[PDB]
Design a protein around this ligand. Structure first.
Ligand code: CLA
Ligand code: CLA
Ligand code: CLA
Ligand code: CLA
Ligand code: CLA
Ligand code: CLA
Ligand code: CLA
Ligand SMILES: CC1=C(/C=C/C(C)=C/C=C/C(C)=C/C=C/C=C(C)/C=C/C=C(C)/C=C/C2=C(C)CCCC2(C)C)C(C)(C)CCC1
Ligand SMILES: CC1=C(/C=C/C(C)=C/C=C/C(C)=C/C=C/C=C(C)/C=C/C=C(C)/C=C/C2=C(C)CCCC2(C)C)C(C)(C)CCC1
Ligand SMILES: CC(C)=CCC/C(C)=C/CC/C(C)=C/CC/C(C)=C/CC1=C(C)C(=O)c2ccccc2C1=O
Ligand SMILES: CC(C)=CCC/C(C)=C\CC/C(C)=C\CC/C(C)=C/CC1=C(C)C(=O)c2ccccc2C1=O
Ligand code: SF4
Ligand code: SF4
Lengths: 129, 31, 155, 151, 80, 725, 29, 78
């Protein structure tokens, strides 16, 4: 069945150029961009709604929380990668494995970068004072 | 006289169950 | 039932202009600087509040109804619990058990010249489901009926 | 734990029965003059505790029945036992009589009334017929005419 | 794959063959009954185990028997 | 897909059923690929070593945590003023309200109270210091290692025993009776006399001094010369072997010197018993010879063939073992409250409730499993030729008579017992409680009077225990049966009558389901060839009227509900009768237990109040908050079981196929593919998972209710008594 | 009391039971 | 009583609407009458309808009942 949700052109261009589908990428750099995206936003719910949200170490607790979530997710993805066997290049076993490695590096890095922005956003207006 | 090792709780109840589940995944899905 | 009793229905006092609802204003500790909310707002936000403040607290009318005029509701409350539980015999089992059990019983009626010509069969698979859901619905709905009517005709 | 050496005595001696007996008679006299028609009126409640006076009561004051076969309490279980087995045996024998005289399965969903009343009347005296069929083996089918399952 | 066995009580009524939604069954010629035929189960690797054949069989106790065995993609009825 | 390696049928399944069924059939060693009889018994012997080792590691963990985190020495110094501690809590989810609610008064951190009774066991055995508990913990861990080594060693090709070794019934019986029962009981009498009785006297005897400490001052000179009464005589030193009888009125527990003499007396009986059967010394009985001689005229071939039936069927042996264990486990429950052995345990009401309820539920599972393996025996191991016309084949031959009469008794009990409760409920509703059917339990009061209970209108038939047990125990026995605050033969009335017949209903009905499942295991009229399909199979399809739940496994499944219901009735009755005793409310029990509203209001509704107030918006949390949470958790798990029990497979399989469609069509997610095709759980699996949630939810709910109601409203009591003369 | 030395001793005894359990569980499989 | 009675009557009738819609589909549906009409096109994406309804019930059940369970747990934990 062929639907307007299944068939929009700049929706097709967007999905085709997400890092999981983008032409010319290595699976590591695919995972790196995916992890950096997810780890960045994932610290938000952990830092703002977590149990230490009203203390001064709430951002640090949300950062270590996000790293914990990405590490457990990577265990599933790296385990998936060892067991697939199915298809060539991106769905290669080594292909998924490099994506799992890139995802974790990018994920933790995206959380640390989002931590640094949330911890030091007063500095962007520090020139005026 | 409150004698606990919190790191032993974290390791035995969080870490090695997730690693046993990963190990059991390799056992039941291989070949 | 709970929201109307806690937030809407009740009595007014001609002094203070005070609204006294049927249930009446839990204090939430929290600090411990107490916070006054209606009982629905303070207690219905978790299942233990529904179990303790709604089901346990308001069942005191129906379980104490014996020896007076709401005692029929106390009997219906117990009887509907029974019918509901009785339904689970039908819902949880299968007719192959019951047909084999009927076989040994038909043997004893055969042995004493009391077997009927209309051969006893277990209920069909579909009917056993229909009997189960009918008694489940009948028992569950009549329990709440006895609960509600004993609660509001006593207070 | 408190041992009860005397769990049962006559109800007329138990003071928790005298509590209840006066509390029921006062409710019956309350509804006789300026009252409502009740199940137990004043003469009905007198006879009720006339029966319970020579019964055995516990400490709560309520009558307790003795079902050991003892004959000063034969009205408690033994006399209702004979009345049950006669009436239940009558209904069982009558269905057994009606089943043997059945034309077919249509007699089981459409009750043949002059056949049913006659079997229910003949069932009323069932031990006139049952025990001469119970020692003869006429109450039972031989074993090679009754179906069984594999073993 | 399930095992579908045909026993010697078969009267050759072909009702199990018509009942089967997977064409597991067929009639071969025989001499053991008046119809001169008996059900056979050559294609039990397509058998899903639905027991519609057993439902159609009129003989006291049945002449066709399905024994549920190892499950495959075909026998589990998977379109995926 | 090589898991599971023991079943190539399962290993080639491409669905998720491969994983579930590999787990569920992993311990069914008889049905595995390539299994022989000899390799089966060799695998079992080593597996049994592993299970033994787990039991000792479990016991060493309890010993370690009580030694390291408990308050045993603080409790030994003050047994009434100190709540025993199971283990510490470290839960990072705890807020400040939960940490202080579980932290005892003056305490360092949050702890769990202990309700296993281990402190009373350790104290009565003579343990007094934490170093006693720690050396027990090390010793059981070493003992666990030895059994693990033994299991590994007896898998090596030089030490794997032959099939004839495992089937040497006579030698195993001689050794298990004489040594495993007899010598072990003799050794325990040694522990009581050398260690536990002197510790009760206040004399510390341990490994450092027990070689130079006489347990009796005349030591071992009265034993060999036959002058044995010196060990019972108070003027020849403190006695070590007595037959006082009854309970110690200072403690409310058994006499320790009676316990020592009990285990010494039964050690001699068991050591003598283990000389009965013929091993390699010419003397003794052949079991096959005893069974073959016992053939009478009414029972056909008698017991002929039963030796080879039992000795070649592990499911028969297991079913016999489970049934005997289940009877003994119930006897443990009934005799632990009636005749308690452990110091300060009858004063701990929560522990007595927990222990009775634990062992009756264990006994209920063991009883159901005994009939399950009896059913498995009939499908898998029963040979009708080798059991031709014996007592076993004759059970199957009149199985319609057995099932129809069991059906009659259960209906006979169920109609009238329910009818009497409903009669009394209607009487109470209409304001006529003197018109209740209150039947006096005079047959059971007759039993009490024969043991010397003084009940006014009930006669001692043979003349009382002065005539019938004129032993040395008689003064201490009669002083304990007729005393107040004594648990021996509790006073019973009409409420006790009605619930005992409800219990008898549950026993007969559960037996009826189990016996019909075991006797129709091989076939019925609806499925005459059922043995060709095995113990556990879903159905035989919708034909012949429909055949859901026709297997012998399904009768196990149906009877678990009835077992849970029956043990529920048993443990409800124990708990309400005892909290009415502990709470000084026996008259309320005697008045309200005769109708079912009284059970709902005065037992369930009234005792739920401290539980469901375990946490609240008004008053915060207290120590009962974990039981309050578990109580709701148990309701949730039990109700989740209903989903599996009611909504059957074909609904879920069509639902899963839409999810399979959704995954394959969703961008960024359809790149991820399952290795095993998602399918709905099988028909049998839905029943098992639904039964598991039902059962776990049943047990957790009642355990949360039983513990929290007792520990809050009736936690402690005296248990001392004044003896009766 | 259970000193820190005795906790360490108990884990060494537990480790030996662990390798014994490892020997048995692989001989069983 | 009046609120509860009419709530029960309304719920029973809506279930009967689902029953007789299904009876229509078994008994009275005809492919010749419904060729690429609204009824035919609903059947041709029934996997899309049910899987989205499966998702939204899981979303709603997690994000409504899970709040009650969150609250039960938070209150018990102090
Ligand atoms: C002719 C009537 C009749 C007779 C003589 C019997 C006799 C018996 N039944 Mg059966 N039974 C009957 C009808 C009858 N039944 C009916 C209608 C049902 C379906 C509800 C059953 C279901 C049943 C079960 C499940 C069991 C028995 C059992 C038994 C045996 C033990 C006694 C007992 O348990 O009763 C119990 C009786 C009932 C539960 C049914 C009573 C319902 C009414 C009162 C009977 C109908 C009366 C009939 C309409 C009268 C018509 C007469 C008129 C036309 C003249 C005994 C042989 C038991 C057995 O096998 O023991 C070895 C047993 O487990 N019966
Ligand atoms: C299997 C259990 C068992 C074991 C291993 C032991 C072991 C021992 N007993 Mg004990 N004992 C036991 C059961 C046991 N007993 C029972 C059942 C009784 C009651 C009859 C006794 C009553 C007893 C007495 C009265 C004495 C011993 C003594 C001894 C010690 C023997 C010292 C000697 O010189 O000879 C030895 C440690 C003697 C000793 O000197 O201990 C230090 C001693 O005098 N035992
Ligand atoms: C002669 C030594 C002796 C002594 C001191 C005891 C003492 C005891 N027995 Mg044991 N018992 C013995 C021998 C002995 N028994 C023998 C030879 C057997 C047969 C194997 C048993 C079978 C037995 C069972 C099954 C039970 C006990 C129990 C008990 C406790 C009962 C408490 C009581 O007040 O009973 C007062 C004494 C009597 C009423 C007399 C009867 C005692 C036994 C049955 C007979 C003993 C002598 C005869 C040969 C008490 C510790 C019970 C228990 O442990 O409670 C938790 C329990 O359930 N005994
Ligand atoms: C010493 C006690 C004991 C032992 C050794 C066994 C052993 C066994 N049981 Mg039994 N059984 C027991 C007690 C025991 N049971 C109890 C207490 C119950 C009541 C709950 C049962 C009820 C029971 C049933 C209904 C079944 C078994 C089955 C089995 C076999 C396979 C187990 C498996 O793989 O499950 C996997 C474990 C989990 C999924 C957890 C294995 C022979 C099964 C079998 O295959 O029989 C042929 C089977 O269907 N048992
Ligand atoms: C409270 C719930 C409940 C009740 C009352 C029953 C009752 C019964 N079960 Mg069931 N069972 C249940 C739940 C229940 N079960 C559940 C959840 C399961 C798991 C699926 C089972 C599984 C099960 C099995 C496997 C077996 C039973 C059997 C029985 C019968 C046992 C014998 C007896 O007690 O006779 C007395 C009868 C009763 C107590 C039933 C109630 C009778 C009512 C009160 C009389 C109605 C009179 C009324 C005026 C008529 C209605 C008219 C109205 C429409 C106007 C009895 C009919 C067994 C059996 O069939 O034995 C022969 C049997 O083998 N049950
Ligand atoms: C008393 C506890 C107990 C014991 C003694 C056993 C013993 C055994 N299990 Mg079992 N098992 C258990 C509990 C137990 N299990 C539980 C609770 C489950 C989940 C229901 C299982 C599920 C299970 C599966 C799926 C399998 C076993 C297997 C085995 C066998 C080989 C073990 C192995 O190679 O481990 C591997 C070594 C380690 C885990 C080292 C740590 C061995 C007989 C295996 C077998 O092949 O049986 C024939 C197998 O495949 N078990
Ligand atoms: C209390 C018992 C109970 C529970 C928890 C469930 C739960 C569910 N049912 Mg079931 N059902 C039940 C009783 C129950 N049912 C009974 C008794 C029957 C027999 C009639 C059914 C028959 C039935 C049908 C026919 C269907 C359902 C469906 C569902 C799902 C609904 C969607 C949803 O809410 O997702 C959210 C999940 C939950 C609310 C479950 C618990 C999760 C909470 C939030 C805690 C989270 C814990 C966390 C994950 C731990 C880590 C949900 C899993 C439907 C379905 O599958 O749609 C998707 C469906 O069509 N059920
Ligand atoms: C509105 C809109 C939109 C959007 C949406 C969204 C959803 C977004 C999101 C976004 C996001 C979500 C973002 C993120 C970002 C991120 C980042 C920016 C990151 C960074 C990182 C980093 C920088 C890191 C680094 C590191 C480290 C630190 C260490 C390690 C290594 C590494 C390198 C990794 C669209 C376009 C569709 C359309 C239009 C509209
Ligand atoms: C099915 C089956 C099975 C099973 C079975 C079972 C499970 C059983 C059970 C059974 C049981 C469960 C039984 C029990 C019984 C018991 C008894 C039999 C007891 C008795 C006792 C007595 C009688 C005592 C007496 C006395 C008294 C009471 C008091 C006084 C003293 C004296 C001691 C005298 C098997 C496996 C085999 C196989 C086949 C099939
Ligand atoms: C074990 C392992 C490797 C886990 C890996 C990690 C994973 C994926 C955990 C996930 C586990 C779960 C929750 C799997 C969903 C279970 C399912 C198909 C339930 C639907 C279903 C219901 C509700 C019934 O009532 C029912 C009744 C009778 C027969 C069949 C059924 C039936 O099918
Ligand atoms: C006017 C009047 C009321 C006259 C009395 C009328 C006369 C003469 C007899 C009365 C028979 C009647 C009314 C009922 C018996 C029905 C029966 C065989 C129940 C057993 C059974 C149970 C317990 C299940 O759970 C189950 C689950 C799933 C599928 C099948 C079954 C199943 O079959
Ligand atoms: S079980 Fe179903 S598919 Fe298999 S032969 Fe029978 S009818 Fe055909
Ligand atoms: S197996 Fe049964 S249905 Fe098939 S041809 Fe033979 S008799 Fe007919």
């Amino acid at each position: 069945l062929l639907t307007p949700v299944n068939n929009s052109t700049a929706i097709r261009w967007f999905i085709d150029n997400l890092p999981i589908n983008r032409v010319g990428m290595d699976e590591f750099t695919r995972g790196l961009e995916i992890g950096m995206a997810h780890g960045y936003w994932l610290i938000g719910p952990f830092a703002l709604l977590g149990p230490l949200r009203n203390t001064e170490l709430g951002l640090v607790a949300g950062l270590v929380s996000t790293i914990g979530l990405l590490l457990i997710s990577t265990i599933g993805l790296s385990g998936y990668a060892s067991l697939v066997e199915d298809v060539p290049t991106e769905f290669d076993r080594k292909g998924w494995s490099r994506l799992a490695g890139g995802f974790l590096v990018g994920g933790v890095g995206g959380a640390i970068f989002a931590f640094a922005i949330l911890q030091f956003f007063p500095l962007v207006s520090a020139i005026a004072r | 006289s409150y004698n606990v090792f919190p790191a032993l709780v974290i390791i035995t109840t969080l870490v090695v169950p997730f690693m046993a589940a990963a190990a059991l995944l390799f056992i039941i899905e291989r070949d | 039932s709970w929201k109307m009793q806690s937030d809407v229905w009740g009595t007014v006092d001609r002094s203070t202009g005070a609204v006294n609802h049927i249930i009446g204003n839990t204090d939430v500790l929290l600090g411990g600087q107490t916070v006054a909310l209606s009982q629905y707002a303070a207690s219905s936000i978790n299942i233990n509040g529904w179990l303790r403040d709604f089901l346990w607290a308001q069942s005191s009318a129906v379980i104490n109804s014996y020896g007076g005029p709401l005692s029929a509701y106390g009997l219906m409350f117990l009887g509907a619990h029974f019918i509901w539980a009785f339904s689970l015999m039908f819902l949880f089992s299968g007719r192959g058990y019951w047909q084999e059990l009927i076989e040994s019983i038909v043997w004893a009626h055969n042995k004493l010249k009391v077997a009927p010509a209309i051969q006893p069969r277990a209920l069909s698979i579909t009917q056993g489901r229909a009997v189960g859901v009918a008694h489940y619905l009948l028992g569950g709905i009549a329990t709440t009926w006895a609960f509600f009517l004993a609660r509001f005709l006593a207070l | 734990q408190t041992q009860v050496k005397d769990p049962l005595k006559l109800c007329k001696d138990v003071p928790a029965y005298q509590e209840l007996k006066t509390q029921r008679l006062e409710a019956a006299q309350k509804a006789q003059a300026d009252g409502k028609p009740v199940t137990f009126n004043e003469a009905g409640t007198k006879q009720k505790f006339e029966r319970y006076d020579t019964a055995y009561c516990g400490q709560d004051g309520y009558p307790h029945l003795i079902t050991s076969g003892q004959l000063d309490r034969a009205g408690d279980f033994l006399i209702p036992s004979v009345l049950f087995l006669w009436i239940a045996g009558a209904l069982g024998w009558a269905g057994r009589l009606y089943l043997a005289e059945s034309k077919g399965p249509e007699d089981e969903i459409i009750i043949d009334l002059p056949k049913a009343i006659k079997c229910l009347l003949l069932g009323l005296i069932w031990p006139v017929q049952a025990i001469p069929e119970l020692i003869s083996g006429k109450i039972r089918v031989p074993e090679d005419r009754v179906t069984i399952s594999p073993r | 794959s399930h095992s579908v066995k045909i026993y010697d009580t078969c009267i050759g009524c072909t009702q199990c063959v018509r009942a089967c939604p997977l064409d597991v069954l067929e009639m071969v010629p025989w001499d053991g009954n008046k119809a001169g035929t008996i059900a056979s189960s050559p294609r039990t690797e397509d058998c899903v185990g639905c027991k519609r054949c057993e439902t159609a069989c009129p003989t006291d106790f049945l002449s066709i028997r399905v024994y549920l065995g190892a499950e495959t993609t075909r026998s589990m009825g998977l379109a995926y | 897909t090589r898991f599971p390696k023991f079943s190539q049928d399962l290993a080639q399944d491409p669905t998720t059923r491969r994983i579930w069924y590999g787990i569920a059939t992993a311990h069914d060693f008889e049905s595995h690929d390539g299994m022989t009889e000899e390799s089966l018994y060799q695998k079992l012997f080593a597996t049994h070593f592993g299970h033994l080792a787990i039991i000792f590691l479990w016991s060493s963990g309890n010993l370690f945590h009580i030694a390291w985190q408990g308050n045993f020495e603080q409790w030994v110094s003050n047994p009434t003023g100190v709540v025993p501690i199971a283990h510490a809590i470290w839960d990072p989810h705890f807020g400040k309200g939960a940490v202080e609610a579980f932290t005892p008064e003056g305490g360092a951190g949050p702890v769990n109270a202990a309700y296993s009774g281990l402190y009373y066991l350790y104290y009565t055995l003579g343990m007094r210091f934490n170093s006693d508990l720690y050396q027990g913990s090390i010793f059981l861990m070493v003992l666990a290692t030895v059994f693990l080594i033994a299991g590994w060693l007896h898998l090596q090709p030089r030490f794997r025993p032959s099939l004839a070794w495992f089937k040497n019934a006579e030698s195993r019986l001689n050794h298990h009776l004489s040594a495993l029962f007899g010598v072990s009981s003799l050794a325990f009498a040694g522990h009581m006399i050398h260690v536990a009785i002197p510790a009760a006297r206040g004399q510390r005897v341990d490994w450092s001094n027990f070689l130079n400490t006489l347990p009796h001052p005349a030591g071992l000179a009265p034993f060999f010369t036959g002058n044995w009464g010196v060990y019972a005589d108070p003027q020849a030193g403190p006695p070590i072997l007595t037959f006082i009888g009854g309970l110690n009125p200072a403690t409310g527990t058994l006499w320790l010197t009676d316990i020592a003499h009990h285990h010494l007396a039964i050690a001699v009986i068991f050591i003598i018993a283990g000389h009965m059967y013929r091993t390699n010394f010419g003397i003794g009985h052949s079991i096959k010879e005893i069974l073959d001689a016992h053939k009478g005229p009414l029972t056909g071939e008698g017991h002929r063939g039963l030796y080879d039936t039992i000795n070649n069927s592990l499911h028969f042996q297991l079913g016999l073992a489970l049934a005997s264990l289940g009877v003994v486990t119930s006897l443990v429950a009934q005799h632990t409250y009636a005749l308690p052995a452990y110091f300060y345990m009858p004063q701990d009401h929560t522990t007595m409730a927990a222990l009775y309820t634990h062992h009756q539920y264990i006994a209920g599972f063991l009883m159901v499993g005994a009939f399950a393996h009896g059913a498995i025996f009939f499908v898998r191991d029963y040979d009708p030729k080798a059991n031709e016309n014996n007592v076993l084949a004759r059970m199957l031959e009149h199985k319609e008579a057995l099932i129809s009469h069991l059906s009659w008794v259960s209906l006979f009990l169920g109609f009238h017992t329910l009818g009497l409760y409903v009669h009394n409920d209607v009487m109470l509703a209409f304001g006529r409680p003197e018109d209740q059917l209150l039947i006096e339990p005079v047959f059971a009061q007759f039993v009490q009077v024969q043991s010397g209970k003084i009940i006014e209108g009930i006669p001692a038939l043979f003349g009382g225990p002065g005539v019938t047990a004129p032993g040395e125990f008689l003064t201490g026995w009669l002083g304990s049966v007729n005393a107040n605050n004594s648990p021996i033969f509790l006073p019973i009335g009409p409420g006790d009558f009605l619930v005992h017949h409800a219990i008898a209903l549950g026993l007969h009905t559960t037996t009826l389901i189990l016996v019909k499942g075991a006797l129709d295991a091989r076939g019925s009229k609806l499925m005459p060839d059922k043995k060709d399909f095995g113990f556990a199979f879903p159905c035989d399809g919708p034909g012949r009227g429909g055949t859901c739940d026709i297997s012998a496994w399904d009768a196990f499944y149906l009877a678990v509900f009835w077992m849970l219901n029956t043990i529920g009735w048993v443990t409800f009755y124990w708990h309400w009768k005892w909290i009415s005793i502990w709470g000084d409310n026996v008259a309320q029990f005697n008045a309200s237990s005769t109708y079912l509203m009284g059970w709902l209001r005065d037992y369930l509704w009234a005792n739920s109040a401290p539980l469901i107030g375990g946490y609240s918006p008004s008053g915060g949390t207290n120590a009962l908050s974990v039981w309050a949470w578990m109580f709701l958790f148990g309701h949730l798990v039990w109700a989740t079981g209903f989903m599996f029990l009611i909504a059957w497979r074909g609904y879920w399989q069509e639902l899963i196929e839409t999810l399979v469609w959704a995954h394959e069509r969703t961008p960024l997610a359809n790149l991820v593919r399952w290795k095993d095709k998602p399918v709905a759980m099988s028909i049998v699996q839905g029943r098992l998972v639904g039964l598991a949630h039902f059962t776990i939810g049943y047990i957790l709910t009642y355990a949360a209710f039983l513990i929290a109601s007792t520990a809050a409203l009736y936690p402690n009591g005296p248990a001392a008594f004044t003896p009766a003369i | 009391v259970v000193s820190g030395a005795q906790v360490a001793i108990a884990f060494v005894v537990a480790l030996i039971a662990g390798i014994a359990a490892l020997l048995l569980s692989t001989a069983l499989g | 009583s009046l609120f509860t009675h009419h709530m029960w009557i309304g719920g029973f009738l809506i279930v009967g609407a689902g029953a007789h819609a299904a009876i229509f589909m078994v008994r009275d549906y005809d492919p010749v009458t419904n060729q690429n009409n609204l009824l035919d096109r609903v059947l041709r994406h029934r996997d899309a309808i049910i899987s989205h309804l499966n998702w939204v019930t899981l979303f709603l059940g997690f994000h409504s009942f899970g709040l009650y369970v969150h609250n039960d747990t938070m209150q018990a934990l102090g």
